Amino acid sequence: LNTFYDVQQLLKTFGHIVYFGDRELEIEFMLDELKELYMNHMIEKEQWARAAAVLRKELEQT
After folding, report:
1. CATH for the stretch 1-62
2. Quick one: which of 40, 33, 39 has its CA closest to 10?
3. Distance (Å, rounded) from C-alpha 16 to C-alpha 62?
4. For 40, what's the count of Cα atoms within 13 Å in the CB-facing half-sphere?
């Protein structure tokens, strides 16, 4: 929805609770997972677009 944490909860719903010790790499992983979820029709286009956007912002902020 709005923050990195929110996206974390979205992906936690689908089993992914990750921590590699590097925010940039965790974000890239998360973006791959979101895309796979959307490609597999498990999340609506609106949620995926917003989730990726939030991750892009987080990436810029880190």
Report:
1. 1.10.287.760
2. 33
3. 21
4. 8
